[PDB]
Design a protein around this nucleic acid. Sequence first.
DNA 1: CCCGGACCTGTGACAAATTGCCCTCAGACGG
DNA 2: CCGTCTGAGGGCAATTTGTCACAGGTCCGGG
Length: 209
Amino acid sequence: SPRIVQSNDLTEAAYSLSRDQKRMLYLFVDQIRKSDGICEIHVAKYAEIFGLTSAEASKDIRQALKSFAGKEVVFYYESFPWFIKPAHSPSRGLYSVHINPYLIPFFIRFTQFRLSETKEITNPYAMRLYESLCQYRKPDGSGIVSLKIDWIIERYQLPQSYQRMPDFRRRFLQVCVNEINSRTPMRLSYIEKKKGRQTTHIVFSFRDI
DNA sequence: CCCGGACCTGTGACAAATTGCCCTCAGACGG
DNA sequence: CCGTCTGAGGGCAATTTGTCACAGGTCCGGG
Ligand SMILES: [Mg+2]
């Protein structure tokens, strides 16, 4: 299946995208890299890739696309918009999109994963976690990395109530660890690092099945 | 000595959002 | 000209995600 690669600057960038938008984003990076910023999406190809109907595919593309407006990207800082013109459909079943050409150098010290690894993940924050572990993966398939909680919150743009740690644990950390273990070929564990009463980092270990 | 207070934890409620499903009907095309 | 495969719309209930009040732990310092 298509091998996604992206600059680490994108893996560690600050943004808030839905699952459907992130799914689309994988195809843009694939299209751009296999070469002005003008990309294209076919309804029927999207449906076959992610096992959706044509109808439900159409709904996902259309609503994802109009939700890009106003979204911004931060590289730690400098902020950019994803799109510089609205999307439009010249033909039935076909969409044309205009990615910000200033984003090109940030797309192409790199991260790589096959698209089948992430296509069953549902929670978008869990897609971001799996991308950040891959950045440190070894050829054989294992790795270990320590991520700071404040940096997790700023990079993944978690909602404000997750600055209370018990909600952070219950609705983000445990769920995203559980999905990865159930939906990817990776087997993931963790332990908490503390300083006084405050929890400051999360330490991730993983191997390949 | 014992307190309220400033921290921390986990859970039960409710509100807001998203999931895969379902149904209708016109466009594009080919045989 | 028409029958079929698409896909652009309109919805749903069942789950998940986002928010906050409340019980219950610790340690410190002033009364
Ligand atoms: Mg959908």
